[PDB]
Design a protein around this ligand. Structure first.
Ligand code: COA
Ligand code: ADP
Ligand code: Y2A
Lengths: 279, 279, 1034, 279
């Protein structure tokens, strides 16, 4: 009979290439390991959910202000009511008798470019202007002549002398605890220009978290500049919204099971049927 | 220096257990093989989409009426307008700028028990009643005493002397072409009982496809009795609706990209906020 | 708005920015003297004080200072010290106004003669800038055109005919340099008198100047923080500058000017021409000295902007107490687009914030207002009267406009019952199509509601142009039928697909309406342009006027609402909602055509002509700017050459000599129809010093430009002029009752219009219909002033230092959990965060990330594996141990029970770790639960089950799936927040399914981001790992 | 007491905007209508799954050659074995005990960039070469200088005197039945060039379905040239692969429930752990 593969590999007669690479977690040992740090030492130095998010997503032990800023961003992105396009889809799928995972996902896949995309779009827009060095007035003028609105600028109701309180909570944390916020100071000079046009055009919570996550990356001492640019490129700020808004989507799933809401069918009077005549 | 795994596997020194089994498709050769039948002979024998559905899902060369009945089921389940719970979620995800796969899926995941579940529920309910030997009057009286509505019985608009045409199209094909329909005759005798209560309580397209697919499985000669009963349990009529309704959900995606509809936010006056006082 | 700058501010702008090949002399040799300065600072900052003689002048915008004895010529520094002691800080009178002398300027003496003094003046007119010159300073005139330059060769031929031969080359290079300084820094006036040019160079001795203050967005870096002083006689107040700070940061207008801060009559009037009419009526009724402020708010300000404007007024009128009480006039005409509901909701919020001192000062509030959503505005303005005890008298459209002035001042009683109640002549026709520039959907729907009620065949708007979105179609209404109007990114696409369009309605901003109007005059189909924006600079408007004269394009505006032709066409928001179109009967023509400066008083002119006359034929609001695109005679000549008009109504203003062209057009026989006119701004001759009203052109530069002199001059011209605005409708009617008596006007039979259905939002807001809400929610509220998580606001979430587990208790359980319950939840999300890539869900996320999919698709592809076999033992161990514990069976009889049923205990049994080799995630969490939880009865049950299964195999310990499961039940059952029937529901509906999914999503996103870092290619499973067992030929 | 919304909307007292717009299906009448065709005449005219697939997706009556070509595309893209990245994920999710919808979806969401994205990419690439009119030799050399491989060219085993038989089946249908194939003849002239480099560089089934669906769109007479260009842009060939491969993914789900396969855990020696040291 032929030799077992596990016996041949253990005593080194053969070698087979590993088809997968991983870096975030080691679990074939005596202890679970998050990016080199064991699960017991994760809890002894009291790094939180934002602390293990720096281990799993960046393989870096972030400073305690960078951990606590990440947690602070997950509570402001946690929910924004049932009217948004993702929390709508979770409610429709929860009311159709589906499980938690199907209902979460059905609204979680609405996150993308138009819903939940302004978080990553404001980071990429402001970092492109700050690195390719132009003054904030030349950036506002550049966006206007190519017909692009600035992402992360503009709130529907909360304008000025009436500030968005999620923005003032997070901006107060960034000013005291972060050592240097160059892109935040750039983006706060951009809204000084756009609030001279309309009072509404302030930094969103989408545009605040976007430009302060970049300042958390390239000004905390853990990341090199090409590493901190890589995470904005591959979408680490997409995952901040997705992990944040998943908490309110699961809370939206569990809410429709409380209330025992039946199956939803959209009314025919809210739909405009413009079908072809016979084609 | 260690030996290759591929060299040791090809000329027979080592053995390694295969961790997967498949039986629907063989592609590691000169021709694509669908369940033992090559892709050239699939097209020479003029079996269609319902003919390859019998190969990929059941591994059987079904008769030409069974292949064509499957194709008729996929066209009546193809779409039922945008007001249903899945076509709603596809439209919301298409209007949120997502791709085809994300938009299809977000409404495809609503299919389950309340939306799209009456295909498999009316099959299992009527099969359980027919195999238990109870007459159609004793089945109607049984479900009344358990507080259960008969799945696949009932329509809200088209009742009697006013038939559902999708039901009458498919019942006509089943009457001429199927060699024996014992469960359809059972389900058409339950309909003669429930239509003496309300005119509305007729066989759905959900409930005629369910009982004629069971009659297609166990009375076409390809399947044994325990083998046809396995497909109803593992969810072959779930896949008939899901493959059928994917045809209209992609058309609902391509419609909202054609019409260039923007992002949907649900109106606040249609939502009833019943939040706690300060908890 | 031309605002006069000081002599110091103009000289420092000249010395920094002039470009002269001759050297300007005494550059920056100015020293500012205030009565609160230190002379040691001046002698250190500027060292030229001792070295030469000095002259001193008050920098208070005083003209003719040398003839009032306010210029001390050829004074040494010690003579300057003695000069200002009887002058600095006390009173003087210049004409009528009288004020303090608190700003003086030191500049060196210049030795010159009367052959050395010159005079250069550059001022802006409509047709260009006149450059003046005179040789005996102490006159040549040259018009430089709108897009024309001033060359030095042109100065020598015209301006310099009497200048001496050796001084021509030094003036013509200064005047050329002075003129480009005027154009680049946006001046509207620049006088240098005298200008001294000796052999040493050019000495600028005095400087009077005005700049176009609406050009601050252009000249922000050249002007700097430029300060516009108030005129001599009035002081500068920090509440005035607060409101001027709000005006410059939106398209809405917010003006405030304190005339007498101890005055008892305060006005908060909407509109810059409506507030002039209210100030005319107050000053007519003997309330000149008691009128406390001029101010207006217009251009549809928001609720927050109107709150900030109101709380400034209410804080200003509640400083000191008046014995007779105080009067607050919250007036205004019928608004066109200013939302009266949101406007008055900002005012009543300021009254509720100031109801304390408003009772002390005996403030009686009189309200008259019409407009969009005004019934909601007048409702909430009457509720705040009774709940705060302030006597608030609320009126509306049925009341005349300035009736609340007579009721407040005590001239007429308050009725108790009507509270709570080559230009072309034909610009517009029933076939007129228009293109709207911008997302003004309520404006476009208002035109479309106008057209259906006017029985038009097709809508007015053909296309919409918005450069910040792609080409699409937007759904509108044709009555009760929905239509689609195309939206275009480019103007050229709209003009090409729609050649039937001859009107552009330009809703671009003040910094976009110049380029959007230059771009649309490249298209020869557009014969009429309406510019809505207020705040375009006067130099940029005159280039629009210049090209409109060349292209033969009528321009209505800027700073206008547009105009309305009943039966044919309306521009944008003119006439307001359809409530006012039907009330003023603007769906069919009448015989009166009106032209008017202001657009909110046109909606009052719609109302006055409707109730006294068979209606309006065509009304045009030409805008409040200094240089409108079309004047009165651009429209009065059209109305004279129109057979449908039988009489004309003009509503002028103060400033400009436009209404004198109407006087000349009558004497030459060109205008023959009866004309009724009234120029508003009669109050401005009763004030001490000059006041700048809300409109950019409402400034009487001469004695003829006053509205008192213009109303007098139209009376000998045969124009029917009332004594005031409150008798304008009496004389519109009286001319009408003559034109019907002589048979000139035959009123047509009244035909009912095609009524539209009511809006749903309008019917829902005031409660005529009910519609059931098809959704319920409990976790989050976002249509408030603040985001709310289950009754708790977002600031109190962060104030009370609850974490991610704290908001998870709010979003999922709607409960304020204790701090150990919030922290145990976070620990469960940290141990379930990841368990390597070998598990089924982390596999699927890696395969989907290696296929090049996004974060959301890759996370989801592995998230959908969570279920029963992967990640299901968390909820399955909780339901199974709770069912055993609630059934009363002991832990031995539960181990025996599931042995007989062929069931392994969920949450018992770990592959490698055992008793005496403990799972560390279990030991971390069990130590938190034992020290912090009050009681753990199911954990003590599940650890007695574990004592039995570890006596079978040492391997069979509690998992982290079965520890979190039995301790989350103890978290729900024993934290005190939950009842048992409610805590059992959460386990039933799957709260521990969400704990695993939210925890493991953190490691699945980490598995997505890891495969993008490593740049792993597409995965394709080996064929030798798959055992193909396909049928033989079936 | 306020009037009903449904009553006031019925007698025309109020108006409310329809927030949705649809064109593909009308369920609210006496018969189900697929883009102007009732469900009865769909079955009278013997238009098949591909016939209703032109109704739901394009709102057009395609000719019977365009309907039957569309069906043959769904038959050849139906499955390609279990080892591809989507059929893997469906098998892992089916072995983890999940339902049909979740298992289909977990492998369906792999489709779009590197798995199954070459179908829409070969259409867009060859159309852009054909429209911006350059000869096939100047297209092969243009992609070489840009460092881009031609999408839809190249098979791992198949080549001349040994063709891909799915390609040969579909090419004979397009040659016999289509009236004009301008882009297929272009892509078969690009194929003559790349086969002179390596014999394996032939037209894929991803490449011939891509260029003959464009030839079906812009040469069947139903479509305007701007209409046919929009369907390629909004992803009509993304939906052809996804609706096709869903037959094999549901067949892969039903196969692992038949075989009763247990939960899959990947081997640890096929994964290469490259975690940081203690970061
Ligand atoms: C002119 C008017 C119609 C439109 O003004 P508006 O809504 O303030 O202006 P817009 O919406 O165009 O936006 C203002 C600026 O915000 C910019 N903006 C908007 N959203 C933005 C975003 N997210 N990011 C960046 N910039 C943004 C716009 O691009 C615009 O640019 P621009 O001013 O440089 O062109 C309105 O201002 C108005 O009512 N004016 C007064 C009308 C009036 O009084 N006329 C006489 C009445 S009788
Ligand atoms: N910087 C200066 N040096 C010398 N004389 C000056 C200076 N400024 C003004 N004067 C004198 O002031 C007189 C004119 O008064 P002026 O200031 O022009 O009155 P106004 O208030 O109308 O400007 C001139 O005769 C001139 O001699
Ligand atoms: O509310 C009003 O009376 C006028 C106004 O708010 C703004 C306006 O037009 O200013 P003006 O008339 O002074 O030129 C309006 O919306 O019409």
């Amino acid at each position: 009979v032929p030799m077992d593969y596990s016996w041949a590999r253990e005593l080194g007669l053969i070698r087979k290439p590993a088809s997968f690479m991983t870096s975030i977690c080691d679990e074939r040992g005596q202890e679970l390991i998050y990016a080199g740090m064991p699960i017991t030492e994760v809890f002894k130095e009291e790094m939180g959910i934002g602390g293990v998010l720096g281990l799993l997503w960046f393989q870096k032990r972030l400073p305690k202000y960078s951990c606590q800023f990440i947690e602070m961003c997950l509570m402001v992105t946690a929910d924004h009511g049932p009217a948004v396009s993702g929390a709508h889809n979770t409610i429709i799928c929860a009311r159709a008798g589906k499980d938690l995972v199907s209902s979460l996902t059905s609204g979680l896949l609405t996150i993308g470019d138009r819903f939940g995309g302004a978080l990553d779009a404001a980071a990429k827009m402001f970092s492109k202007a700050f690195d390719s060095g132009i003054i904030p007035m030349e950036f506002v003028n550049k966006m206007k002549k190519e017909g692009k609105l600035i992402m992360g600028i503009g709130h529907r109701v909360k304008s000025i002398n009436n500030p968005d309180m999620r923005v003032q909570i997070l901006k107060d944390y960034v000013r005291q605890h972060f050592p240097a916020t160059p892109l935040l100071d750039y983006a706060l000079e951009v809204e000084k220009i756009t609030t001279s046009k309309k009072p509404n055009l302030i930094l969103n919570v989408d545009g605040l978290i976007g430009v302060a996550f970049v300042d958390m990356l390239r000004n905390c001492g853990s990341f090199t500049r090409e590493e901190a640019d890589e995470y904005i490129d591959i979408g680490a700020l997409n995952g901040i919204f997705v992990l944040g808004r998943s908490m309110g989507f699961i809370g939206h799933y569990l809410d429709q099971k409380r209330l025992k809401q039946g199956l939803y069918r959209h009314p025919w009077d809210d739909i405009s049927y413009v079908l072809p005549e016979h084609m």
